[PDB]
C-alpha cells in the first residue's frame, strides 16, 4: 500500500508505502459488498445441506446476512429449475449473531436464513461459518469453505499498532487501545456481534493473557490480548450485546455519576440508566472498578458495565441485559 496520510492529532503528514488499516465501521456508505463466486455452487451446497437434515443457516458476519438478502431470489430460482421444492427465506438480524453447530460442504420444504430463534428449526440444525474469501464500492468474492472451525475468517481481520495506539479491526469491529501511563482498551465500536473466535494470528500481545480479564469476551470474537484489558474490570459476559450495534467507551452516562465504594453490589448483568418508563437513575457505584466507568451506548440509550450498579435505586425497577 503506497500513498500519503495526514494525522490530525499528531499534526504531521507522511507519505510512503506499507500497510493501511482503515476504519470500515464509521463509513458513511457501504465500502464493501459480499457476493458469491458461483451462486450455482451455493445452490448445490444448500441442496446437499437440506438432505443432511439442515433446516437453515445463521450468518457469522453482518455482510453475510446482507448478501443472503440480495442473493436469495436467485438461490430460490436455481432451486426451482432444479425442481427441489425448497424455499429459502431470509429475515433480519437479532442482537448477537448466534452460532450454529452444522455446516455446509463444497463441491413444501423451507430453508430459513437468520431471523429470530425457533424450536422448530433450532441452532443445532443451522449452518454457520462455511464461507471464506477468495479474492476481490469495492467487491469481495466468496466461496465455499473446507473445514468446520470456530474461527472468524482470517482474510477479513486486521491489526495495527503505532505511536502507542493499537487497533484490532474487522468488517464490523473496531477496537482501540492506548498507552496512557499503562496499556489498556479505550474505545470499541460494533456494528455486529459475532460468536466466532478471534484468531491469534491476527492478535497483538496474545501471550500471558487471562481470558477472565479480557474485556470483550473471547466467545464474542474478543482478541486474546493484553490490549483487551482495562484495570479494575473483568470479562463483560453479560454486557448489552443483544443490542447488536453499540459503542463502548469509558465515560459517565449523561446525567449520572458513578462512585467507588465497597458497599456497592456485586457485578451482574448490565443495566441501562433509563427505566422502561423513562426515569433516569442518577447515582451509581462500583465495588473495585476504575473510573471513568465502562459504558455502552446503543439504539436505546446508555448502559453501564457489569460492575456498575445503582447506588440507591433497587435493581428490580431497572432494565437489564438478560
Amino acid at each position, epitope marked *: 500500500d503506497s500513498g500519503c496520510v495526514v494525522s490530525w492529532k499528531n499534526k504531521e503528514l507522511k507519505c510512503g508505502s506499507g500497510i493501511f488499516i482503515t476504519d470500515n465501521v464509521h463509513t458513511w456508505t457501504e465500502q464493501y459488498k459480499f457476493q458469491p463466486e458461483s451462486p450455482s455452487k451455493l445452490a448445490s451446497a444448500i441442496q446437499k445441506a437440506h438432505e443432511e437434515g439442515i433446516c437453515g443457516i445463521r450468518s457469522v458476519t453482518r455482510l453475510e446476512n446482507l448478501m443472503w438478502k440480495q442473493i436469495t431470489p436467485e438461490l430460490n430460482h436455481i432451486l426451482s429449475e432444479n425442481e427441489v421444492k425448497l424455499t429459502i427465506m431470509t429475515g433480519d438480524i437479532k442482537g448477537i449473531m448466534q452460532a450454529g453447530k452444522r455446516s455446509l460442504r463444497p463441491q413444501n420444504q423451507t430453508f430459513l436464513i437468520d431471523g429470530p430463534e425457533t424450536a422448530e428449526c433450532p441452532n443445532t440444525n443451522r449452518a454457520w461459518n462455511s464461507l471464506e474469501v477468495e479474492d476481490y464500492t469495492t467487491n469481495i468474492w466468496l466461496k465455499l469453505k473446507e473445514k468446520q472451525d470456530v474461527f472468524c475468517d482470517s482474510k477479513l481481520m486486521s491489526a495495527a499498532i503505532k505511536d502507542n495506539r493499537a487497533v484490532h479491526a474487522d468488517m464490523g469491529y473496531w477496537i482501540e487501545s492506548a498507552l496512557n501511563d499503562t496499556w489498556k482498551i479505550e474505545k470499541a465500536s460494533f456494528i455486529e456481534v459475532k460468536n466466532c473466535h478471534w484468531p491469534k494470528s491476527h492478535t497483538l500481545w496474545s501471550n500471558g493473557v487471562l481470558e477472565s480479564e479480557m474485556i470483550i469476551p473471547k466467545n464474542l470474537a474478543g482478541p486474546v490480548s493484553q490490549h483487551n484489558y482495562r484495570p479494575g474490570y473483568h470479562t463483560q459476559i453479560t454486557g448489552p450485546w443483544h443490542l447488536g450495534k453499540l459503542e463502548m467507551d469509558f465515560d459517565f452516562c449523561d446525567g449520572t455519576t458513578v462512585v467507588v465504594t465497597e458497599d456497592c453490589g456485586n457485578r451482574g448483568p448490565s443495566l441501562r440508566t433509563t427505566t*422502561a418508563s*423513562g426515569k433516569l437513575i442518577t447515582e451509581w457505584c462500583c465495588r473495585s472498578c476504575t473510573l471513568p466507568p465502562l459504558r455502552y451506548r446503543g439504539e436505546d440509550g446508555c448502559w453501564y458495565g457489569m460492575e456498575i450498579r445503582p447506588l440507591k435505586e433497587k435493581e428490580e425497577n431497572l432494565v437489564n441485559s438478560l
Partner: antibody
Amino acid sequence: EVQLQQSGPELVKPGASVKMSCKASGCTLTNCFMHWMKQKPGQDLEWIGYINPYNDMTKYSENFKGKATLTSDKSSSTAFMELSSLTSEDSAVYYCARGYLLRTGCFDYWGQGTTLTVSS
Amino acid sequence: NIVLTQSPASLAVSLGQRATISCRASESVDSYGYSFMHWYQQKPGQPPKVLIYLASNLESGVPARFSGSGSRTDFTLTIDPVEADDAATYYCQQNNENPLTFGAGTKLELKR
C-alpha cells in the same frame, strides 16, 4: 410542566420549502427529545423523527430522510424542521411533542400543532 | 415495521357503559420484560394526550376509569364507566423498534 410552543400557520408555493420551529420550556438535558409527527386531516399519524436541542442527537424515519431536515438551537432550546421539495401530500398538521429515546417513555406533552397548506 | 391494527374502526357507547378497544401488533412489542405500548386520547383540534403508558400504567392525573392490559401482540384499553368527556379518537402506539408506529385510530361516539 414542559411547555411546547410551535410556529404559526404557513402557506407555501409548490416545490418550495418551509422551516417551522418548536420552543421547549421546562426541559432538561437528559429528556427533551423533540419528536415531529405529520397528520393529514383525520388520518393516521406519521412519525418523522426526533432531535435533542442540547445533545444534537437526531434520528429520522426512512420515509422522511430525503424530505425533512432537523436543526436545533441550544440557547433558544428550539427545534427546527424543514421540508425540502413540497407537494400537496405535505399539506397537513405537523405536531411537535416531547418524547424520549427508543424503548423510553411515551409522548408526554405536545405543542399545539402547525398547519401547512401547500398551494398557489 | 411493526404495524398496529386497531379494532374497531369506530365505536358507539352509551353513558356509564364499558368501552373496550383492542390493538394488535404485527411483531412483539415486548423487551426487557416490559411492553412498549401506549394509549392516547385526542380531542379534535387538539394535541393528543396520554392515558396509559406501557401496557398497564395509569398516566399521572388521568381518571382511574381508564385501564390497559395485554402483552406481546395483543393489548386492550378499557374505559369504565365511559362519560361525556371521552368523545374523542383513541390511538395506540409502540416504541419497541424503529420506526415508531401508531394505530389507525378508534373514534368513540357517545349514545344518549
